[PDB]
Amino acid sequence: KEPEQLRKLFIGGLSFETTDESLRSHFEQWGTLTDCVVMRDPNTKRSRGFGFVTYATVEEVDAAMNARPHKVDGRVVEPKRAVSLTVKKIFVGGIKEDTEEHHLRDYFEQYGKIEVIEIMTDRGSGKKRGFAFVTFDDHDSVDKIVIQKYHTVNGHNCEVRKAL
């Protein structure tokens, strides 16, 4: 089984009327839920407006994220993968001088919709510096990318991190 932390979705912005049961009935549409909790005050039992769900597999997390926007009990909520900042841009290092835009696009477009690819060049000489930035239309692409142990693009093992 994949590590549980990689199977969780933190759901912010809940309606205070959402319950463990209604959150579960909603998110079970995209996979088997091994856990589903609405966070509540320990004294009043009033909802804290957020909670979490745990799927059986990472593929199911992907399916839930691909089904956004989620309207749960009448309110659009904000699911995010667990920490294991929320940004839309990555740094890609170690691509050397022969990696081109299409190598980066063909690979990273499978994580999400790309808005910008910036291959970095030397301000003085114009030579490629061996790193790039990729901006996506949404943060979940970045979140999937940075939890991978490895990234291989154009035969190179790359270092990938969130950018600003």
Ligand SMILES: CN(C)C(=O)CNc1ccccc1
């Ligand atoms: C045969 N296997 C293991 C797969 O197809 C998994 N694929 C997968 C896709 C997205 C997220 C996590 C996993």
